RNA sequence: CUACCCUUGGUCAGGUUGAAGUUCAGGUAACACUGAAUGGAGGACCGAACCGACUUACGUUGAAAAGUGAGCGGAUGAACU
RNA sequence: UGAGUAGCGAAAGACGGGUGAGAAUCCCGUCCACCGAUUGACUAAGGUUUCCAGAGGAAGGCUCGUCCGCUCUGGGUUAGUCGGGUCCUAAGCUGAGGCCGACAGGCGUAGGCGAUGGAUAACAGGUUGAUAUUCCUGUACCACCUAUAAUCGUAUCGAUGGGGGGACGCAGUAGGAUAGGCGAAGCGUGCGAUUGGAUUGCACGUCUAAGCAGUAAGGCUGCGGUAGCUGAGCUGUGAUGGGGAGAAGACCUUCGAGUCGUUGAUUUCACACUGCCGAGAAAAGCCUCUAGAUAGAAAAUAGGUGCCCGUACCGCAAACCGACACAGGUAGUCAAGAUGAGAAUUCUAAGGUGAGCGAGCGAACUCUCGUUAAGGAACUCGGCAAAAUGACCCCGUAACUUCGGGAGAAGGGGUGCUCUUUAGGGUUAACGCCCAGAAGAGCCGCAGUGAAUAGGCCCAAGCGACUGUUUAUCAAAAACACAGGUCUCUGCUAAACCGUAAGGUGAUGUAUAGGGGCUGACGCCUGCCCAGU
RNA sequence: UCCUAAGGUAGCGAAAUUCCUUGUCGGGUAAGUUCCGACCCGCACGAAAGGCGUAACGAUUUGGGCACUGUCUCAACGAGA
RNA sequence: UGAUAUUGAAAUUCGGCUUUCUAACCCGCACCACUUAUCGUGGUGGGAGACAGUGUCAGGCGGGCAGUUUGA
């Protein structure tokens, strides 16, 4: 059958991209959490 | 002028259809064109505001002159055309500098003269002329409530009204739908009544031919659950249940009286309709 | 993913039936009403692709956390993508 | 522990050589078998080195392994023209000032971003173990630079703007051409396994763009509005004194090989013409107009310059999504011969593949298939399942109907092969090639649509009119929807609805209109009560 | 003769509605708690949460026939996993 | 639906509901300028007008929505 996931290069950047997250103030604490706890892949 | 088909299949058995026989050119004018994407009857916020539209066939919009502004220059009616945004045919007028304009087709208008000024146009299917100028008895459509905004009273296939008696400042119009009220004589109108008046004799016939037209079905709220309608549901099939029918929102829906307590045009208003 | 909608694209081997209208010739004070051709309408007909899931068998520490075999429905449209 | 028990994931393999410590499983060869509207050939998304060569067998591969999409070492992707950027724009998403909000921030104008569409200059061969419209060979085209020669100027370049153009739906039939097919000795093979053959039996029969010619059919007649025009498939010279070429004389070598008349024909090349009602984006390139700017070599000569990103491999699959080397799912394109209406059915071509555990025996039982004497639903909650009917031609067919239907009603008869024949036809100097019928006379079998593919029907009731829709994963229905009917609210900054602010939908609509409740084609009808709410 | 705002009209009726109940009387069977046609003692039908009819349509429910058959009387043999 | 603030005039009238006038306030009304965009600002006309809109206080309706109770 057809499954959940259909990968998508362009629409994942466009969701989950590192400038959509800088674009609101809820998505910057996103990257200042990560920041925080010392994690390697910030977004995307 | 109503065709009838023939029981040859279901749906079409009883379907009707119109004529077209007083269309004269099947082509719109391309420099009178614009876009007009479908709405869906969803706001800006993105959300459903207004149910059962959706679909239908694409359509053009055509720029339609209500304010008819020029000064005494006649024009001449050019051609008869069907227009898919309005219940009503369009006519394409020439005017004697070149400028091309579209207006309402009145009923039992062909090509001609037609001009727009007042204290020297005629009374005469056509002609568009200030309240002041139109004597008691008239029959007239397109009427304006703003000096200079455009008609927007009786502008349907088959609407009009009737000038009655004038009271100083104001004249006295029977619209339509009954109601007596008193309009500035300033106000511009048109003479005559909105022609394809066999347009509301139309029998759709099935299901699909409305769908196409911008349609989308309507569940009744009786066969919904208690959680979606006041209505809601019972064990089989149950009567109303409340001392009056509600709406999907909470609100009585027969003979409960929705217009404003106080408002301007309350002092215009004589009798309301009946 | 799924439900509805918006903008812009693509797809449906073959066969069958023969509505309106039109045309000539008999009609007729005018119409009416008849014929033989032309004509190709339809949520129309049979049936692949494609899209669906009505019956039954098998499988159920399965090949598969919903499938497979054999029949079955729609198939120019309220169609599918 | 269960236990050396279940399982080892749809399918045809056999033998002879080679390698090696070790071979049913790796390599080569010959037979056999399977797919072939395809398991074949190209290409988007996604994956991200899985691609090539030599060298390896610990682990991974449901067995084995000398082998690998596994390990080690070294390699592989070449563009002015192909697909995207220095071109345009739909939806949508963001917007200097501005409007509105306890704070954040929510709306929105000019302006920008954004293809799944519009515009836009290259083709045929050759070559590597791994790339090819990119490299190479042969011939083209577009934009932009530089110098030097034709009119011996009161020409030239034009907007930031104006007007044309671009520019668009669905259905149906006919017609003109061309691809790919088929049949004939125009060329190269070759003529004999086992009984008689010798108009024997095989295979081939091609060639781009661009640039010059004239070309079926199509639409249109005396700057914008008012009162011998434009486009057009195909054909033919040459390009090509080349390229390719089934084969030949010689056991990345040199070298002279044939390219023709006839038939049948698209789903490819035109929204062209015609009809219909549901009435079918935008913008730029492009061609004009004058504002103004006040000065040349775009039909032509000889030389120069032209950037960035992607390009390997898989791509109906062992590499994508599914925990797996998983009977599942995944857009588009190319579409051969016999049979046939056909892309159905059976067997084959081009080109692929033989499935990653086997060998024996032929118990019970279970699963998937094939027959069965005499009865024929006696089975069972129930004809569940199975069986039967099935294509084409020709006769013929009831009650009821909203006159269209019912209807393929129900029933019955024909069907192979050979011969003898005669004013249907299409294409053509004849001839020949193709398509298609009615008669008569014969032959063979238990059987002639001899295989495969293809409606059981009929007499009566309940419900819903009808096509359609619904509980992804135990309910497809009498449930929802529907055309029609009726009540009621709303005169426009409309009612209703979201936010309940701005701003929006309704609607670029105006009572023949829009929102809400209840009924549910059509036909005949729809009575009485207003004390209560 | 009491009471009420008025005391169910047309049509239909053991019905997707009838508890008594397998009501009773006629059809179909050798044998019919189901089915069809009629009787009204309608517990508890009824006119737009409409009433009564209706051609054409249905992978809808229901009863009776023809054809056919391993469904069965009653089992037997063969092929493959 | 009333009181009061925003909110000023004149007259009728057996510390006042009502005809009445422009000057506050309002206009998804028109023509101009910013500007070859009408979102917005400003100016001139027209319409309306001390009403409407807005703040505080008060009364009524209010399963539309919310928190809970319903014994042994």
Redesign the pocket.
Known sequence: ??????????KHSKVHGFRKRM???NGRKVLARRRRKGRKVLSA | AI?K???????????T????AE?TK?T?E??L?????????????????????????????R??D?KRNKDGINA?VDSIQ???????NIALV?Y?????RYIIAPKGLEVGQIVESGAEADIKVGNALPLQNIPVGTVVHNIE?????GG????????SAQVLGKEG?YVLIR???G?V?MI?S?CRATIGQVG??????????????????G?????????MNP?D???GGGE?????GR?S???????P?????????????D???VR??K
């Open positions: 059958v057809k499954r959940t996931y259909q990968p998508n290069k362009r674009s609101t103030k | 065709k088909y023939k029981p040859i299949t279901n749906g079409r058995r009883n379907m259809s119109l004529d077209f269309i099947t719109p391309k420099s064109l614009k876009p007009l994407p479908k709405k869906a009857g969803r706001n800006n916020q993105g959300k459903l505001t207004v149910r059962h539209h959706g679909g239908g066939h694409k359509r053009q919009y720029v339609i209500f001449k069907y227009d898919p945004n309005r219940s009503a020439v004697a500098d070149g400028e091309k409530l703003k000096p200079g905004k927007q009273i009786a502008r349907s296939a088959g609407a400042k619209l339509r739908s109601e009220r500035l300033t394809n008046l066999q347009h509301e004799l139309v029998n759709v016939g099935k299901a699909g031919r409305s769908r196409w037209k349609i989308r079905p309507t569940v009744r709220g009786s066969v959680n309608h006041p209505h089989g099939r149950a009567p109303i001392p029918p509600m709406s999907p929102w909470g609100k829906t027969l003979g409960k009286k929705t217009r404003r307590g106080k408002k301007s045009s002092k215009l208003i309301g309709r």
